[PDB]
Design a protein around this ligand. Sequence first.
Ligand code: 71T
Length: 223
Amino acid sequence: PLLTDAATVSGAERETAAVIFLHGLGDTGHSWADALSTIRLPHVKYICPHAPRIPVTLNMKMVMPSWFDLMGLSPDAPEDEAGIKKAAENIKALIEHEMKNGIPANRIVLGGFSQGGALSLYTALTCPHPLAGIVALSCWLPLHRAFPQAANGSAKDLAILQCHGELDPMVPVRFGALTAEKLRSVVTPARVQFKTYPGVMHSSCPQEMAAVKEFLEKLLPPV
Ligand SMILES: COc1ccc(N2CCN(C(=O)c3cc4c(s3)-c3ccccc3S(=O)(=O)C4)CC2)cc1
């Protein structure tokens, strides 16, 4: 029984493509739905699911919206393997639902910000269906030591746009750079675009939103 709580930007024309975008820790999908609507394509649907509220270890076990538990801020810190995989399964059900209802997998893009971006990278790289690509913003690859081995054979065709703010204090830009190297270990280095933005911190920016629009226009053309 699939029950999805989300803010969805509908296409003005019949939808022939889907973007599933995952917000960052503590948020809802509302703000990112509004942001993606400002750059929307007429035949593209943008699904922004709301993360479930769980206790987060790093925040004194406080209950808040989170895709999985968080324990440390360094690349060697323990990660919530069971939580990351369960959340990836819930996203993979959303992918299969869109597929069951007439949207080809090579017309589905996964994406997200920070924690949500991190889940979208894990899920797309391990998805058994060949997806169009990923829009990974200010994030990292969860369970990075399992890659490239852990990636599905279907990950070869992915097109990746990875963005980062150069002055990000939450997810240092070097962690984004290390993640991009790991992504080029699965996808051809030419199909991974790593864009960094000077003077940008842990946020989006109009140049990043423009890059996302340009990437999706080329990746998801009409019909
Ligand atoms: C292949 O290269 C890499 C490079 C680095 C890593 N790391 C990144 C750090 N990390 C984390 O678990 C967290 C990241 C964030 C956490 S906790 C957080 C905590 C409190 C508030 C907000 C947040 S946050 O904004 O979501 C960012 C372990 C893995 C993996 C692979």
